[PDB]
Ligand binder design. Structure first.
Ligand code: F6C
Ligand code: CLA
Ligand code: CLA
Ligand code: CLA
Ligand code: CLA
Ligand code: CLA
Ligand code: CLA
Ligand code: CLA
Ligand code: CLA
Ligand SMILES: CC1=C(C/C=C(\C)CCC[C@H](C)CCC[C@H](C)CCCC(C)C)C(=O)c2ccccc2C1=O
Ligand code: SF4
Ligand code: SF4
Ligand SMILES: [Ca+2]
Lengths: 80, 139, 62, 751, 73, 74, 135, 74
């Protein structure tokens, strides 16, 4: 149960969604970009916290923040 | 529901543990045109079948690790399910039937802040309040 | 702030705060909220030298 | 079908790419945006597998780089013989190799460092070398410094050949991939032509140079009456007063070999098997017989594999036939596939080969260290106590670094060259498919030994502090005798089946004491409770080193945390702070931690060696036969509490390096402090992270932006992996220089 | 130095293995109420800082007391 | 004496580095160019991932942790 | 301070002269230590009295601070010499030694150069020229 | 006499680290730029890099010439 907030500085480069190993992010239509897209995080209980989405965001001081919060059984990735 | 023939695999040690049938369990289901071999996300190698393939994995990251491997075999028709122990099977990937890199209509901006990240409020503003500085309904 | 002009950043969250960069292109749609693409001679941190900005946090130097 | 196929002038020879460094990587060859580019240019200079993609061009870089490496060793070998030629007391040490200390590498008079030129006996001032070069040149037959000098010349011209051969085989005639992949022909020539002919060549030297020269040097002829080595062959009558049972003529003296009347050779190819009691080394006649036995047995070994004349073995389907319709029933568990697809592993990837060749060169170097103390091969080696310790210690450390490097490339093979299709259900895949049962049982035995080796030292440390020495694991309290090792010590001394060896090999095993210059060359090394406990420290530290290194190989591909750990690479810092934190999950980070465990393990091995010789083996013999050891039986009673290690070994035996100022041992005092600085300095890089350091550069870049003196090569704090590499490179450097200084100051202050 | 040099993800892959061993072995009837995980990043920095401090103080406390109360009364 | 001179500069060096670590950790607690949003993440957090070069020990807590070593040393 | 006396009159230091080999090192230097303020242990020392040593606690300081600034000035002036050339990215990895030498000869008379850097308001960058963090 | 000195200096070292720990908590949680607009506390943040760069100079100065003077004497 992390918190992946997306800010208005996205450019719809789509790179944050590809890096996510757990499919938390996905693109929705938007208008504040030439791409007309913005990241959204509908599945954040699945967020593992790897911040691999933040490494891919190219906007300077990146538009997507993982906010490591209450860690549960699927946000810590336990197979046992 | 879910069905398919399991790949040729001699069984591993990295597979399902007691969390599989007690909390919940995942299943990736894909169709292959060829009888080739893929790397198991739980260590090893298995031969994927000719028709409908079904594989049980402990956590969702393994399924999308394997799903990202299937795209290197030019297979993009996989579906990831989540099996609760009581038995019902949810469809979770791809959630709308199209892959999340693609943009649909009807999806909603969820956890979107309509401000730059730079003007999140100071922690003193939300002092002794339920919210954090990053929800912050201002702007 | 047209293309080719050296411009200064007034965005405190940015790596290039109070540093100059050359404008690469301007977006003429007018609905993108960050039309200016300005290019920098210093990469920020393991990455880019290009960032999108709005009209109001830029000031031209020449 | 084995063939020589090469290219013609594949790579031009110009300085075009010298002026553009980082050309090998496309990311490096676009500009130095930050200082991270500088460090990436060195961490990637030799990873040829990322410069190109085709194995043909990679293998040409490997083969050409070996030549430039052999050039470097020949430069270094030339430097050893040149220093032995004109900067040493080797002439003086040949006359009296007991009272004269071996010394090359004199020191220039500047900065007051002439004090390091200590007195060596014979009026020669220098630094007492402990490399054993002198004890090896005497066994090679060197007598004067002209032979040493011309060998140094013969090595510089030999290094020039290595440099030319490397340029020639990359820029003029580079072999194709078919020439490299016939490993089955390479084994034939390395087993027969290199190791077989090499030890056949050497036993030629031993019989005709070393055996006569060391025969006369044992009768005291004092370097006048020594004939030059060629005068033993030009004058064949000169070797009939020595070894009279042979014939010694061009043709008339060699025919006993062909007519199989080998009894005439029994006087110079002996099988005595002991220590020559006048020099303390092995009998050179017994050594010459060894190399002839080795030569015959390696030339034979080089005919095992099948090159293009039909006859021989094929490794390809000797491996492929180790399936399980055909195994012993108790080890028939390794797959119907078995070893298929594993000849393509060890042929299509150099990291697979480098991992094995390092783990066996490392294990060989440690075996060699154990064999060159228990049966010294060189004259006057065993009595030079500073050389015995510094040769054992050098080769244990060298052998332990190589072993860790064999586990590095076992992991680089996994995340770069491991191929699932050629490795389906075979012997390699079935290991990855149960890698939790391998690590569970390794992590248990690592923990069983941890309590039953170290925590028994804390039992002893507590009973001796309570004043209960009768309930401590002593020879006097609760004895833990090495029953199975004292048994072997009994087996190896009653067999003198093997009856012909009338003299016991390795006086360490038992029987007799050899004193050469009054100093003991070698004694029996008895094993008591202190040797039970110290051997299980060794078992414990080796296992955890294996546990760290094997974990990095098995879980290099994936884990339950990160199922796609192979896509992140071999050398990545982490996968973010999620899953609670995945710091140091890479396979590189298990090499980095196994280096510490190699340091822990081997520094305990050399401490076990150093104290057990000083207390039980080394010493001096008086005029009655009793042996007064250097510390005097100290190991048996006080090495069982690790307070005894700190006071009777570390505090007591550091007296020579602590009180070393204003003496000739002054430089070991500085190295001993220097090693302490570097160890403490390493902990800056190990305990901290680069977020603090990057944020400190920003405050320092500001002070340069203020005075308009900022650089355009933007200062970046070192990478996470770089900062961990710096930490382990300094911890191991500092913690070894302090041990190197402590060993040699202690043993050059004695002899 | 163990908590300060070696970091978290090494220990999670090793605890994940021990958790496999416990589940698959007979006669081990205990089972964790809460999943064993390698202790967190900011905690090991604190656990290792406590040992460094306790070892800094016990070593010097014992030195200073014994090196002064042995030469003298 | 002269031996007392040198230790008072070791002591002065000690008090300055451990002040540098703590002052850097207090004044950069609000954030610096490596992560300008440290106030949102709290006081004791591990890092901000391996991106932007790697941000190990970036929190203000890790400057208090790093300065206990220098305090004990001093 | 008056505990320090010259090594001329110091019983603990003539003893240093008595048991001294020569070899190059303990005669030619050790005569020159006779002019130093010498403790009650025969060890030359650096004291700060008054004009007695006011020139000797200025020869090392003037020689260092000049050549430290000389290194700093030539290194600084070479950096702006290549920032203006717009080639400073690779001008730093490949040192332009004719330009660097010409920046060293500017740094011989650096103390008078820094004054006219300062008096022109050109040495120090203005505060909103400088990249900073959020603060 | 020896233990009492070492006790209170080590106690004082920890109190100095915690004085600067809670300075860092104060900046993060209970500090705002609104009330402290233009005051003495906000003027420090205006030049927090001038302070840190100067503790960096003194630390570098005092360690080069104390270690360097010790290991010259060594
Ligand atoms: C109940 C519960 C339980 C059980 C049962 O049921 C168990 C079991 C097991 C088995 C099967 C095995 C083997 C055993 C042996 O050998 O050795 C011993 C040990 C012990 C520990 C022993 C123990 C046993 C029991 C616990 C006893 C009891 C005690 C008492 C009761 C207490 C008292 C009470 C009071 C209150 C205090 C094991 C192990 C391991 N562990 Mg294990 N456990 C557990 C718990 C725990 C905890 C808490 C922890 C943390 C500390 C851990 C940890 C660990 C590690 C590291 C390891 C290893 O290494 C190993 C292995 O892996 O293999 C391989 N683990 N495991
Ligand atoms: C003067 C002769 C000469 C010239 C002009 C070249 C030129 C070239 N070589 Mg070549 N080479 C030569 C001799 C030469 N070589 C010899 C004698 C060998 C056998 C070792 C090689 C083996 C070789 C290989 C395997 C490769 C090249 C490559 C190249 C090309 C890339 C340049 C480069 O490597 O950047 C670097 C510039 C340098 C000056 C590097 C020198 C570093 C030396 C070797 C360090 C070793 C000694 C070191 C000091 C050890 C002491 C350490 C101590 C301080 C602790 C370039 C056109 C590469 C290529 O083909 O590009 C795609 C390629 O991979 N060469
Ligand atoms: C090396 C530095 C140093 C030295 C020489 C001392 C010396 C002393 N301390 Mg100590 N102490 C120190 C550092 C030091 N302290 C630090 C950094 C702390 C903060 C944790 C403490 C906290 C502390 C407490 C609470 C007490 C002392 C006390 C004492 C005095 C009696 C103990 C003794 O005989 O000496 C032995 C040498 C030692 C190193 C032992 C010191 C005692 C340790 C540090 C107590 C640790 C507290 C621990 C958290 C609680 C234990 C857990 C409990 C549940 C079992 C003695 C003069 C006692 C006192 O006040 O006298 C009446 C006492 O009550 N100190
Ligand atoms: C009898 C024939 C013969 C001999 C003596 C050698 C010897 C050697 N080979 Mg070679 N090799 C051979 C046949 C032979 N090879 C064949 C037929 C193939 C094709 C399958 C290869 C393919 C091969 C590869 C790919 C490599 C070697 C390498 C080496 C060197 C190993 C370095 C070492 O262990 O110690 C060093 C021992 C030295 C004894 C003395 C060097 C003196 C010269 C070089 C050889 C002796 C000359 C002799 C008088 C004639 C060594 C000099 C490695 C190497 O170092 O590359 C240069 C390596 O990369 N070999
Ligand atoms: C493999 C290297 C090697 C080389 C180059 C030589 C070379 C030589 N040996 Mg020789 N030898 C060797 C190994 C070698 N040996 C070994 C392993 C043995 C023990 C079986 C002998 C035992 C031997 C005897 C007994 C004699 C020679 C002799 C000779 C010399 C003349 C014989 C000849 O032409 O052939 C010649 C220079 C003859 C000689 O001239 O004595 C000085 C002589 O009679 N050898
Ligand atoms: C035959 C021996 C051998 C060979 C050919 C290699 C070759 C290689 N190793 Mg390697 N390795 C070895 C032994 C060997 N290793 C041993 C014995 C160890 C244990 C310490 C290692 C552990 C190791 C690690 C952890 C890594 C490699 C890597 C590599 C690759 C790149 C090397 C590089 O970065 O450029 C050259 C780098 C340097 C010259 C740095 C030198 C600085 C050293 C540490 C200072 C020495 C201190 C000095 C003596 C005082 C390269 C293929 C790297 C890789 O990425 O593989 C793909 C890598 O991550 N090795
Ligand atoms: C010519 C280049 C140059 C110049 C003019 C300066 C100037 C300065 N540096 Mg700097 N520095 C440099 C290169 C340079 N540095 C390099 C290459 C490094 C990496 C080792 C550093 C790392 C560094 C740190 C960590 C700090 C400074 C600081 C300072 C400032 C005061 C302390 C001082 O005298 O220098 C300090 C000098 C060093 C630490 C060693 C560098 C000196 C070598 C010899 C550079 C010569 C390069 C050659 C001319 C080309 C001062 C304005 C301090 C500050 O923040 O200001 C208050 C500070 O903390 N520097
Ligand atoms: C009057 C003094 C005082 C007070 C009231 C506080 C109060 C507080 N501090 Mg603190 N602090 C202080 C002094 C103080 N501090 C000093 C002197 C230091 C320097 C070391 C610190 C450095 C510090 C840091 C880095 C942090 C705090 C934090 C906190 C807050 C949470 C407390 C907590 O973590 O839960 C309870 C704490 C514990 C239960 C401690 C755990 C165990 C410790 C390490 C003792 C272990 C000793 C060991 C068992 C002894 C060995 C026994 C034997 C073997 C010898 C709290 C408001 C936290 C904060 O600000 O929240 C955001 C925070 O992260 N402080
Ligand atoms: C022997 C151990 C050792 C040494 C020498 C240092 C040295 C240093 N630390 Mg460090 N530190 C250490 C252990 C050590 N630390 C440990 C275990 C930790 C806990 C992780 C820290 C955490 C730490 C932090 C958080 C900081 C430092 C800082 C510093 C630097 C500032 C002091 C100074 O400039 O003096 C002068 C320089 C020296 C004394 C180094 C020696 C000079 C060498 C030998 C030059 C010769 C090189 C040539 C090849 C020979 C300095 C290089 C501070 C800093 O970087 O200041 C800006 C900084 O903020 N340290
Ligand atoms: C100190 C430190 C740094 C900073 C390390 C640095 C900046 C390396 C210092 C090496 C200096 C910069 C060498 C530079 C030499 C210059 C080129 C000067 C040479 C000029 C003369 C030859 C003329 C880290 O980046 C780091 C990262 C992760 C964990 C721990 C640490 C860590 O402890
Ligand atoms: S959050 Fe980052 S990666 Fe994702 S669309 Fe926006 S800018 Fe691109
Ligand atoms: S950035 Fe550093 S602290 Fe954060 S997860 Fe990676 S290694 Fe750990
Ligand atoms: Ca008893």
């Amino acid at each position: 149960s992390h918190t992946v907030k997306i800010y208005d500085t996205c450019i719809g480069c789509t790179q944050c969604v590809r890096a996510c190993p757990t499919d938390v992010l996905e693109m929705v239509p938007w208008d504040g970009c030439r791409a007309g897209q913005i990241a959204s995080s509908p599945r954040t209980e699945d967020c593992v916290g790897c911040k691999r989405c933040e490494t891919a965001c190219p906007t300077d001081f990146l538009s997507i923040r993982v906010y490591l919060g209450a860690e549960t059984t699927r946000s810590m990735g336990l197979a046992y | 529901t879910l069905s398919g023939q399991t790949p040729i695999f001699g069984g591993s040690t990295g597979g399902l543990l007691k969390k599989a049938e007690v909390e919940e369990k995942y299943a990736i289901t894909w169709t292959s045109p060829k009888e080739q071999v893929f790397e198991m996300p739980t260590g090893g190698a298995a031969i994927m079948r000719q028709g409908q393939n079904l594989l049980y994995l402990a956590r969702k990251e393994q399924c999308i690790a394997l799903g990202g491997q299937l795209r290197k075999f030019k297979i993009t028709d996989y579906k990831i399910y989540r099996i609760y122990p009581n038995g019902e099977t949810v469809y979770i990937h791809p959630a709308d039937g199209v892959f999340p890199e693609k943009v649909n209509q009807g999806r909603e901006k969820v956890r979107y802040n309509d401000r730059r990240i730079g003007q999140n409020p100071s922690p003193s503003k939300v002092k002794f309040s339920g919210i954090a500085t990053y929800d912050a309904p201002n702007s | 702030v047209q293309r080719g002009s050296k411009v200064r950043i007034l965005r405190p969250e940015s790596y290039w705060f109070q540093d100059v960069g050359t404008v690469a292109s301007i977006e003429q749609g007018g609905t993108s909220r960050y039309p200016v693409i300005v290019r920098f001679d210093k990469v920020n941190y393991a990455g880019v030298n290009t960032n999108n900005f709005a009209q109001d946090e830029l000031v031209e130097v020449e | 079908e084995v063939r020589v196929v090469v290219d013609n002038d594949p790579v031009p020879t110009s300085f075009q790419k010298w002026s553009q460094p980082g050309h090998f990587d496309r990311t490096l060859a676009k500009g130095a945006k930050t200082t991270t580019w500088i460090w990436n240019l060195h961490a990637n200079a030799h990873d040829f597998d990322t410069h190109t993609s085709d194995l043909e061009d990679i293998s040409r870089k490997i083969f050409a780089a070996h030549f430039g490496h052999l050039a470097v060793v020949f430069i270094w070998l030339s430097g050893m013989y040149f220093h032995g030629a004109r900067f040493s007391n080797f002439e003086a040490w040949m006359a009296n190799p007991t009272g004269i200390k071996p010394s090359a590498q004199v020191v220039w008079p500047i900065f007051g460092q002439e004090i390091l030129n200590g007195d060596m006996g014979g009026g020669f001032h220098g630094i007492q070398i402990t490399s054993g070069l002198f004890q090896m040149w005497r066994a090679a037959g060197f007598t004067n410094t002209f032979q040493l000098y011309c060998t140094a010349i013969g090595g510089l011209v030999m290094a020039a050949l290595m440099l030319f051969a490397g340029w020639f085989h990359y820029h003029k005639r580079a072999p194709k991939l078919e020439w490299f992949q016939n490993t089955q022909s390479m084994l034939n020539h390395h087993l027969a032509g290199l190791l077989g002919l090499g030890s056949l060549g050497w036993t030629g030297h031993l019989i005709h140079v070393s055996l006569p020269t060391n025969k006369l040097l044992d009768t005291g002829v004092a370097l006048k009456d020594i004939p030059l080595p060629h005068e033993f062959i030009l004058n064949p009558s000169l070797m009939n007063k020595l070894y009279p049972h042979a014939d010694w003529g061009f043709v008339k003296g060699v025919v006993p070999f062909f007519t199989l009347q080998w009894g005439h050779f029994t006087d110079f190819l002996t099988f005595k098997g002991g220590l020559n009691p006048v020099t303390g080394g092995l009998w050179l006649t017994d050594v010459a017989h060894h190399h002839l036995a080795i030569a015959v047995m390696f030339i034979i070994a080089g005919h095992m594999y099948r090159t293009n004349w039909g006859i021989g073995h094929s490794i390809k389907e000797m491996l492929d036939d180790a399936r399980t319709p055909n195994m012993l029933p108790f080890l028939s568990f390794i797959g119907p596939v078995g070893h298929k697809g594993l000849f393509e592993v060890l042929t299509t990837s150099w990291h697979a080969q480098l991992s094995i060749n390092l783990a066996m060169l490392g294990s060989l170097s440690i075996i060699i260290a154990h064999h060159m103390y228990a049966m010294p091969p060189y004259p006057y080696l065993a009595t030079d106590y500073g050389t015995v310790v510094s040769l054992f210690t050098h080769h244990v450390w060298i052998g332990g670094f190589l072993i860790v490097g064999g586990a590095a490339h076992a992991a680089i093979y996994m995340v770069r060259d491991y191929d699932p299709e050629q490795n389906f259900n075979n012997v390699l895949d079935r290991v990855l498919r149960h890698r939790d049962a391998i690590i569970s049982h390794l992590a248990w035995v690592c923990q069983f030994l941890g309590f039953h080796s170290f925590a028994m030292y804390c039992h002893n440390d507590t009973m001796r502090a309570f004043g209960r020495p009768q309930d401590m694991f002593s020879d006097t309290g609760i004895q833990l005798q090495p029953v199975f090792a004292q048994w072997l010590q009994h087996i190896h001394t009653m067999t003198i089946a093997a009856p012909n060896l009338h003299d016991p090999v390795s006086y360490a095993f038992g029987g007799g004491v050899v004193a050469v210059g009054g100093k003991v060359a070698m004694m029996p090394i008895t094993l008591g409770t202190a040797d039970f406990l110290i051997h299980h420290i060794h078992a414990f530290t080796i296992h955890v080193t294996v546990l760290v290194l094997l974990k990095g190989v098995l879980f290099a591909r994936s884990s339950r945390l990160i199922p796609d750990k192979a896509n992140l690479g071999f050398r990545f810092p982490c996968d973010g702070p999620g899953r609670g934190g995945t710091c140091q999950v890479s396979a590189w980070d298990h090499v980095f931690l196994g280096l510490f465990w190699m340091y822990n393990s081997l520094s305990m091995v050399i401490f076990h060696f150093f104290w057990k010789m000083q207390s039980d083996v080394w010493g001096t013999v008086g005029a009655d036969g009793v042996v007064t050891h250097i510390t005097g039986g100290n190991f048996a009673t006080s090495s069982i509490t690790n307070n005894g290690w700190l006071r009777d070994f570390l505090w007591a035996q550091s007296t020579q390096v602590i009180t070393s100022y204003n003496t000739s041992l002054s430089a070991y005092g500085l190295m001993f402090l220097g090693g302490h600085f570097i160890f403490g300095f390493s902990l800056m890089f190990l305990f901290s992270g680069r977020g603090y350091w990057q944020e400190l550069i920003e405050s320092i870049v500001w002070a340069h932006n203020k005075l308009k003196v900022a650089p355009a090569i933007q200062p970046r704090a070192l990478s996470i992996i770089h900062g961990r590499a710096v930490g382990v490179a300094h911890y191991l450097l500092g913690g070894i220089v302090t041990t190197w200084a402590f060993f040699l100051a202690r043993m050059t202050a004695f002899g | 130095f163990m908590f300060l040099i070696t970091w978290r993800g090494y220990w999670q892959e090793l605890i994940e293995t021990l958790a496999w061993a416990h589940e698959q072995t007979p006669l081990s009837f205990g089972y964790w109420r809460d999943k064993p995980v390698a202790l967190s990043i900011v905690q090991a920095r604190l656990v290792g800082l406590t040992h460094f401090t306790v070892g800094y103080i016990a070593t010097y406390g014992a030195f200073l007391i014994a090196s002064t109360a042995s030469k003298f009364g | 004496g002269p031996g007392d001179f040198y230790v008072h500069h070791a002591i002065a060096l000690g008090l300055h580095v451990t002040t540098l670590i703590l002052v850097k950790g207090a004044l950069d607690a609000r954030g610096s160019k490596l992560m300008p949003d440290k106030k949102d993440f709290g006081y004791a957090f591990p890092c901000d991932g391996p991106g932007r070069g790697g941000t190990c020990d970036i929190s203000a807590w890790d400057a208090s942790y790093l300065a206990v070593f220098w305090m004990l040393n001093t | 301070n008056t505990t320090l006396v010259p090594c001329y009159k110091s019983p603990a230091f003539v003893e240093r002269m008595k048991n001294a080999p020569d070899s190059y090192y303990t005669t030619k230097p050790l005569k020159a230590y006779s002019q130093l303020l010498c403790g009650e242990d025969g060890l030359p020392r650096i004291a700060l009295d008054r004009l007695s040593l006011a020139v000797d606690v200025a020869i090392p300081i003037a020689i260092f601070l000049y050549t430290a600034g000389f290194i700093g000035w030539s290194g600084r002036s070479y950096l702006q010499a290549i920032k203006k050339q717009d080639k400073a990215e690779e001008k730093e990895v490949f040192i332009d030694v004719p330009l660097f030498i010409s920046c060293m000869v500017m740094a011989l008379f650096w103390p008078m150069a820094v004054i006219k850097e300062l008096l022109a308001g050109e040495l120090v960058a203005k505060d909103e020229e400088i990249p900073i963090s959020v603060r | 006499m020896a233990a009492l000195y070492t006790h209170h200096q080590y106690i004082a070292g920890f109190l100095m680290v915690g004085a600067f720990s809670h300075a860092a908590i104060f900046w993060i949680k209970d500090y705002d730029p609104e009330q402290n607009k233009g005051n003495v506390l906000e003027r420090v943040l205006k030049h927090k890099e001038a302070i840190i760069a100067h503790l960096s100079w003194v630390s570098l100065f005092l360690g080069f010439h104390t270690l360097g003077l010790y290991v010259h004497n060594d």
